Amino acid sequence: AERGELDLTGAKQNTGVWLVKVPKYLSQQWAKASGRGEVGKLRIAKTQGRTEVSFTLNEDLANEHPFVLQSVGGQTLTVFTESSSDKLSLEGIVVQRAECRPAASENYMRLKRLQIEESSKPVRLSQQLDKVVTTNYKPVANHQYNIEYERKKKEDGKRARADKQHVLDMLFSAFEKHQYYNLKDLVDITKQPVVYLKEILKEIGVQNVKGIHKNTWELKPE
Template sequence: MGIEALPADKLALEGMVVQRAECRPAVSESYMKLKKLQIEESTKPLRFSQKLEKAITTNYKPVSNHSHNVEYEKRKKEEGKRARADKQKVLEMLFSAFEKHQYYNIRDLVDITKQPVIYLKEILREIGVYNSRGPHKSTWELKPEYRHYEEGQEDEEGKME
């Protein structure tokens, strides 16, 4: 059994309990004062209201429209509504995008082509497959007949053998 010193003058005791003992404090005036203070402390509310002498002026005042929202609105107005481009042009943009990556989500394709989502989905249904599950969930990929990059990989593998 050992006693070791802890920070802030606290003690720790190590050992095995061999016999049980019950201890009662000596009921004295100092003990009663201690208990009274403990009870008063426990009954105090955790939160309380306080009257301030003067108004606090360091608070931030509400803003009706933040600067980043104004910038976003200005940019949206400049770009205007997305106009439908020629279908062939959109197809070329999509094929060039799919040459870089095999899978894209719809948001990325909208950013690349600058086309309305509905129009883009019409075109993608013709040339692509939507992955609704699996590792590439919520993404589009080209249909096998439009994937020329896979055939290129197969040709290279055939040459190696």
């Protein structure tokens, strides 16, 4: 007994179930209400040496479905369900397979044609355009992206050169986090001018040639 255990009780009882193939319109009508608890009646008629299966559509639902059985000896089928509470169980074993066919032949294709046309609605096609489009590259005093970026740079303003002591303290404090830093990445952390930062870094720091990516600055003066 565990979460992954399968409740194989249905197999023990050898419960039999029927697998039925039905078209979409029959199920679509059921899906319309799908909560009235009734969609039709399944009638089975048996004779001395012949059995026939047929289904009748509900009168309210509409506002004959002959059934053909199929051999199940070529493949063994079982039905299982997964509970929302993580408790899998086996409903039973399929004992017969059936298929549903339309009683009508001529006007039935008309319904199918509507479905094919209906499923063709998302099929987008190129549209002829009477007048050439004149709204492209239409007059703008400035592109919106240009004003946004320029405004941001102006607001963010200037990278102040802090007193060497403050810059040095920040550099040494950040050195503990990692052994080596990239010049570009170090600039963001220190937020100082590249030329000014390089001069400070040169005064104490040095760059070591690394054969894996490239020569990078090392915060350790020695």
